[PDB]
Amino acid sequence: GSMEASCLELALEGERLCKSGDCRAGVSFFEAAVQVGTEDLKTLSAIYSQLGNAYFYLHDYAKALEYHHHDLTLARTIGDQLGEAKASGNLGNTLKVLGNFDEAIVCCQRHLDISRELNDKVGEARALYNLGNVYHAKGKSFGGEFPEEVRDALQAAVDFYEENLSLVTALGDRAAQGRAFGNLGNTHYLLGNFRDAVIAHEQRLLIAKEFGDKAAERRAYSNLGNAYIFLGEFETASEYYKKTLLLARQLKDRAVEAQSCYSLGNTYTLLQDYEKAIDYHLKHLAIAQELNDRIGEGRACWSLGNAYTALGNHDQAMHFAEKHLEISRE
């Protein structure tokens, strides 16, 4: 019946609620537990870290940063190096999302270095994935014709992801491999290594199927299609977007489905088919407005007016722009 005992109890309920996917409730329990307090700084460290992650998942990145900062500091106070490595990785990930890449890199690098010192291979691998992510976001945030420092950041990302894959292969960690393959493929895409991107997304697709992860499967098909566009193989691309459209309906994901239809219309145009294009753009706007999607609504129109203006229908084209200008002004 100490203060220590109630803090623990509140925290356990916090952890339970968060695992169940109710982060909003869990946050309050962790805040209650902080309110009650405890003299065990190890317990308190774990509560801060869970608050940081809970806020991160709720997209309150500014709060996530605050709590991961407290956790890092407290980890240093008590000399818990494993705890320090974890907090720094968490901090770097939050910094990355906020667009503070320079400090993000320093924090994620501290997570890697300490994992190495401790001979913690699981942690080392996670830190490498985190580092690939930061260098990727860093290179992508700028603005084939890239400044040297941008190409260098993207190529470091490739190296981190490949180093990660080598360790998680040794560890037998399939979900970790799925994550790395996907982001590696995206990094190759940005570098214009389109063949390598396909290879990476193919591996990512295979793992998505293994897990029965229909959403990851859907991402992979979509990324594969994008890469085939830039390889010229427009036919194969439409075939992958068709796969995503099928999946979009199974998942009952309205927006994703809008995306799938929009892409196919754009691909047929590169194939010089304008009817199919129109039918897909039609579905997109139909689903767009259905989601309170103003930006999307207009996009379809400029597309549609270009497609009718290619068909030879110079009236329905010249029409289409009119509803676009309306949403434009709105």
Partner: peptide, 18 residues
């Protein structure tokens, strides 16, 4: 847009070490 995989985060629990 290319669609990214999720970030991982490192986790701690109060049940660690007892």
């Amino acid at each position: 847009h290319m669609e990214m995989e999720p970030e991982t985060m490192e986790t701690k629990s109060v049940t660690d070490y007892f």
